[PDB]
Design a protein around this ligand. Structure first.
Ligand SMILES: [Zn+2]
Ligand SMILES: [Zn+2]
Length: 367
């Protein structure tokens, strides 16, 4: 069940061959060898316990996998099917040795999709979208300067009227804010700022009233405040935010959103480093970034890419991928998504191959 060995059957442990031990992908995303399918004599898949279509009889074998070793609904739909199958096969050849590890993981996910079933087709679409999105975020990093990245981030933060004082200093300030507001007190801007300023243990570049005001502004943008006015504006900490864990979570998330609006793709380890100074929060930041991902964020990313691509001119003519990327972003990731039609499946996979090929071409010929 390890994604790394896809050329071997999970059950029989032996590598796949073209005659007897034959790769057969099921609807659940697992590929088991034919001999084992015959040998099972049980309805479902031992790994997930999902029911099946019918036997080995109606299930085709993965050719896409076998390359690395050595007519139901009518003519139109099966033309679509054959084309799609061909696409997956063409992608699989990148798995022989070029692509990055996280990319090829999603490729492997794509290969294990059985295209003669609804489940497998849905999985194929999701894997397609994931591959597209990952390609976009890998094209953005090429046009993104890693050296001055932090500088740009903090610039974006300061431009919104917010401020980050550093990993320790910010913890201090936030715990002072929390101290004042944890019981439900309603303080105005100046009162909260004055309360926090005086309690700051002196370090050298001491935050002034304005800086702390900016940190408070950051907490206000994150919607931590119940804000009221009797005709001075009073701010209260919502019941769920009166813990340091929660409040800090919202704080971090807000800064991440600032990074997104400005178009900075930043890894969770880098976030843990910037915000906390250490690596302890990597999983925390991971959860934060994942929680922040809307299905509309793919399209957003495509647009951002187009912006950066408008800056440099276009040495690689990547705009040719624009109609392909827009199609990949237009498919519902939600479980509420209807199963794809045959034309949708074909167009999706075609889009995927065009895009991935484009990515490789860019990396090799333009840098
Ligand atoms: Zn087996
Ligand atoms: Zn399974």
């Amino acid at each position: 069940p390890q994604w790394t060995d896809f050329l071997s059957c999970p059950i029989c442990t032996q590598t796949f061959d073209e005659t007897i031990r034959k790769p057969i992908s099921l609807g659940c995303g697992h590929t088991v060898c034919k001999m084992c399918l015959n040998k099972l004599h049980r309805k479902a898949c031992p790994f997930d316990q999902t029911t099946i279509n019918t036997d080995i009889e109606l299930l085709p074998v993965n050719s896409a996998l076998l390359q690395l070793v050595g007519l139901c609904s009518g003519v139109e739909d099966t033309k679509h099917y054959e084309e799609a199958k061909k696409c997956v096969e063409e992608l699989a050849l990148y798995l022989k040795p070029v692509l990055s590890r996280p990319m090829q993981r999603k490729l492997v996910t794509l290969v294990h999709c059985q295209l003669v079933e609804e489940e497998g087709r849905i999985r194929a679409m999701r894997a397609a979208r994931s591959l597209g999105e990952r390609t976009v975020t890998e094209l953005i990093l090429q046009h993104q300067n890693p050296q001055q990245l932090s500088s740009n981030l903090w610039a974006a933060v300061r431009a919104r009227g917010c401020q980050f004082l550093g990993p320790a200093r910010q913890e201090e300030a936030l715990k002072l804010v929390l101290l004042a507001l944890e019981d439900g007190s309603a303080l105005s801007r100046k009162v909260l700022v004055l309360f926090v300023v005086q309690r700051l243990e002196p370090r050298f570049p001491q935050a002034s009233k304005t800086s702390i005001g900016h940190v408070v502004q950051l907490l206000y943008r994150a919607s931590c405040f119940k804000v009221t006015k009797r005709d001075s504006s009073l701010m209260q900490l919502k019941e769920e935010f009166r813990t340091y864990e929660a409040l800090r979570r919202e704080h971090d998330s807000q800064i991440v959103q600032i990074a997104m609006e400005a178009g900075l793709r930043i890894a969770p380890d880098q976030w843990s480093s910037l915000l906390y100074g250490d690596q302890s929060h990597k999983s925390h930041m991971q959860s934060i970034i994942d929680k922040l991902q809307t299905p509309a964020s793919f399209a957003q990313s495509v647009q951002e890419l187009t912006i950066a691509l408008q800056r440099t001119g276009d040495p690689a003519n990547l705009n040719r991928l624009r109609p392909h990327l827009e199609l990949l972003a237009n498919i519902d990731p939600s479980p509420d998504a209807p199963p794809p039609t045959w034309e949708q499946l074909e167009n999706g996979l075609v889009a995927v191959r065009t895009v991935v090929h484009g990515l490789v071409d860019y990396i090799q010929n333009h840098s």
